[PDB]
Design a protein around this ligand. Structure first.
Ligand code: FAD
Ligand code: AMP
Ligand code: TRP
Lengths: 528, 525
């Protein structure tokens, strides 16, 4: 018996309690699990966004049904991230400005895979038409019915809870952490120790043997999960693993956030996250029932905390001296290695990027999934650790590259921030992908039906940013292929097939924008 | 109108006629297609085994249903490649030798994809039991009902044609090329020109403009497909593109082949390809109705042509001086680039590896699929050509590295051939994959029911199950089980029901299925 007997998880919040819960189920009560978290000085619920795999891959694995957790964390629905004013210059504003060509400066990044005709994705058929003047429709409205639905602020389920489209979740992070702590302690025999860590005890090889708490108590274990946040108390401090700062790729490194009460009966609820462009960065809007979480993400090299706070308060008509603000100064990048010896970093202690494409919780889920799959015995095979490291390296870097694209291919150059983005070098992987897009070829072509994509995580993980996500962002910012896909010139029967799929998206959007309840109405059913 | 108007295809083998037919349908009669083949310069005349995606990724695109083409080219079923005597020393023989551990030296590489429990494929649950002396079963018989079925020589369909398992196809190459020529000419308005090519006409930029025939005829076109075989009359000769010799990775570079008539009433028909190991290489056996195709693949650096021919004749009880033999001297590797300017290499002109895992025709439909997707206009965008080149590079490498595995991890050391195999330079890709397998981790985990689509099975075609079939078949095992299994007793238990399900299915189906012979006699009746 050479197995791990005890796992110690430093830190609660979302990372620690997702880790505790997933491992509880994965390790089938053959391993003792201890969470050590300091006492929680509660901080205002700024809202967090998720991706659609979360219910299948996490809550369903734990047997927690969707309604049960949503009702305990004031959860709303999310059908896309909506980008507002990313192409036009000037101060932030909730309202979209107007382009030269007369279009409103908004584009959606919805969920799901694009349909195909003669194995060519709908993206390419729309591009042909748009380059050739045959259409004035935007990519998002042409190719996703969800675009029509989000414009009408309708819900992604009918009131009897039949599904209409794909969706993910908005919620208060700390309420989810609490729902999960309580799940893990009552139903999974996790030991909750509320205290500070003061010492990390290590052997001759530098493997951790226990953590000392402030009350003097010593927690022995065989594997340690650093969920300590940015401080990286195990992975960076004790293990001495270097962080790789990646501000050479993204410039934002601060936020100022808050909750804003909201007339849900007057305005309706948006079933989506909004990325509202500002002078020195951007601002999230995450609708929940009653309120919305918002935060101005900025660079401190292009705005002071004051400059940012004023601009952010101006946005929403808030009083700066009578408004409760959280001020984060995050690090952007990842550990050289996520897992050193017997210390596995998960969450902010592992890696971070601005929450521009709802990456935070997915990064946590991806790591714990990958920890369960590569779970070690006490010999800590170096290949096991290496492969875990490789999965996290690629997951992170590919998503950094994807985020850089949002900035490098913004046409905005008014403020020194937006111009500064154009002076960064693009990574080789994303240059190669732009070269491909520009010749009209698909990038990251989905090779699987949506059922398998959102059913089997391993399938989604091999192809997280698909063709449709590249087209949503490139075409949304106004980068287009140089020309259509040449094969379309030879395929009039295929062009015609695509015209029926464009029709099918119109029919669905029309039919559903009529029959669906408002987002507000579904929430009011759910939480009452 | 900046589009290609005319496409000329040099060579009317399996490559040429697959190309003509696919493009006919893909290009929707907007483009004139010409095949130029000399009926006197024979096709290589081999190309007999296939992989299971052939029907989806080709005949379904053409709207030809499976029965229609099988009945016209004397097709049999294939449920695996069966490796005979790959672990034991001495002269070739159709009959399997006996291992030290007392079992016969045979392992299968079947196609039927592996069930999972708690997201871990059945491969890993078998490996746990075998490494912990808790099972005596080999991987193939534990994890695939196909193994039971091939041992009983039963068919992979019932007589009412309901499917039993996954499978690929055996057939006569020349009958397929004929059924395809005739499809392409009658239903797709392709022009068949029976004549020899004598000169390749080129502009100042080095693009081909036409091909000159011996009868003085000039075939103009804007895009050329070199299906000329190993000669590479357009891609290598005219375009001056170098072939990248890869005998640093595989040592076989010759074959000697023939058909053997076969008592199908006496023996039954084997629903599988046999890879029978020899002293200086190996020998394929490819059952069809009435006959079986065979050929000794060898290195000429470790056997002379006579050495090989004698050994091959010995195998089957053939008379060397009164038996009709085909003698190929193939090249192993790929063009530095498959597509140069306006010349696209497809088939033996593009790339090749020994027919150990029936990769030849898959390479053809992969390339044509990729040509249709990257099809150019007259501007010949450099990015389009580069990406086409990249997909052929990776397709090839993925299959080469998989093949190298069969050799580097053979335990045989009797003849200087088998010992030479242990001095191969392994590619980085296959070293990394062995390192992974050895830690007990899955290699190229399939993420899908086989419900899912040609595109699905293409950059990592060779799945977990295929690596386990070969590694574990030759006796390379993980160092230890997958550690996560130590913590998952409920999962271990679930797997015990899947092992039971493969037993029940093999038993139930070895009873209820018709013999391979009997299904063929219904099909070709
Ligand atoms: C030993 C061996 C075993 C194989 N086994 C398998 C297997 O089991 N399974 C599998 O899937 N694949 C296998 N393959 C690969 C497969 O056989 C081929 O991919 C396919 O059958 C034919 O390739 P091709 O048509 O490119 O070439 P070829 O058949 O060589 O075609 C050459 C063509 O060029 C024409 N030509 C040449 N010069 C001229 C000219 N001047 N004018 C006009 N025409 C000209 C010839 O007339 C002919 O039509 C094997 C290959 C070899 C060598
Ligand atoms: N020294 C520590 N001892 C115990 N818990 C800690 C320590 N440092 C951070 N944490 C916990 O780590 C989690 C993430 O911290 P933060 O990112 O600052 O919210 C919280 O639950 C903290 O209480
Ligand atoms: N694989 C993700 C990709 C995605 C699409 N739209 C998004 C919006 C935000 C975050 C991720 C996404 C999904 O389909 O769910």
């Amino acid at each position: 018996d050479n197995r791990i007997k005890t796992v110690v998880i430093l830190g609660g919040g979302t990372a620690g309690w997702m880790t505790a819960a997933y491992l509880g189920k994965a390790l089938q009560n053959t391993v003792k699990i201890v969470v050590l978290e300091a006492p929680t000085i509660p901080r205002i619920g700024v809202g967090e966004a998720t991706v659609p795999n979360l219910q299948r891959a996490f809550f369903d694995y734990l047997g927690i049904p969707e309604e049960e957790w949503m009702r305990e964390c004031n959860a709303s629905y999310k059908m896309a991230v909506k980008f507002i004013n990313w192409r036009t210059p000037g101060e932030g504003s909730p309202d979209p400005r107007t382009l030269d060509d007369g279009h409103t400066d908004t584009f959606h990044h919805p969920f799901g895979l694009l349909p195909s005709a003669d194995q060519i994705p709908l993206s390419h058929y729309w591009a042909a038409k748009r380059l050739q003047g045959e259409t004035d429709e935007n990519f998002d409205e042409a190719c996703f019915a969800d675009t029509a639905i989000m414009n009408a602020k309708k819900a992604p389920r009918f009131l009897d809870m039949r599904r209409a489209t794909n969706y993910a979740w908005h919620f208060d992070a700390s309420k989810v952490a609490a729902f999960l702590r309580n799940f893990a302690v009552t139903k999974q025999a996790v030991e909750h120790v509320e205290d500070e860590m003061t010492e990390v005890l290590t052997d001759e090889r530098g493997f951790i043997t226990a953590l000392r708490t402030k009350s003097g108590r010593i927690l022995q274990g065989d594997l340690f999960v650093d969920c300590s946040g940015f401080r990286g108390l195990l992975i960076n401090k004790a293990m001495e693993e270097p962080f790789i700062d990646m501000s050479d790729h993204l410039l934002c490194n601060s936020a100022v956030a808050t909750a804003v009460p909201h007339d849900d009966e007057k305005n309706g609820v948006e079933p989506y996250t909004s990325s509202i462009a500002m002078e020195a960065g951007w601002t999230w809007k995450i609708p929940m029932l009653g309120r919305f979480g918002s935060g101005h993400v900025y660079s401190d090299h292009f705005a002071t905390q004051d400059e940012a706070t004023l601009a952010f308060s101006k946005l929403w008509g808030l009083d700066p001296d009578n408004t409760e603000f959280n001020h984060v100064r995050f690090r952007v990048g990842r550990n050289r290695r996520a897992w050193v010896r017997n210390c596995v970093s998960v969450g902010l202690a592992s890696c971070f990027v601005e929450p521009l494409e709802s990456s935070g919780i997915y990064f946590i889920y991806a790591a714990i999934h990958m920890l369960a799959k590569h779970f070690p015995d006490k010999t800590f095979d170096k290949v096991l650790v290496d492969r875990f490291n490789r999965e996290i390296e690629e997951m992170f870097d590919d998503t950094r590259d994807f985020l850089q694209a949002h900035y490098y291919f913004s046409p905005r150059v008014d403020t020194p921030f937006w111009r500064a983005n154009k002076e960064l070098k693009l990574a080789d992987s994303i240059k190669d992908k732009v070269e491909t897009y520009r010749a009209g070829l698909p990038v990251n072509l989905p090779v699987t039906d949506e059922g398998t994509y959102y059913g089997n995580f391993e399938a989604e993980f091999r192809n997280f940013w698909t063709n449709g996500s590249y087209y949503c962002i490139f075409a949304g910012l106004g980068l287009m292929p140089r020309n259509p896909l040449p094969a379309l010139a030879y395929k009039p029967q295929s062009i015609a097939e695509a015209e029926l799929l464009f029709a099918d998206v119109k029919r669905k959007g029309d039919t559903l924008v009529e029959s669906l309840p408002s987002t507000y109405d579904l929430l009011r059913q759910l939480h009452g």
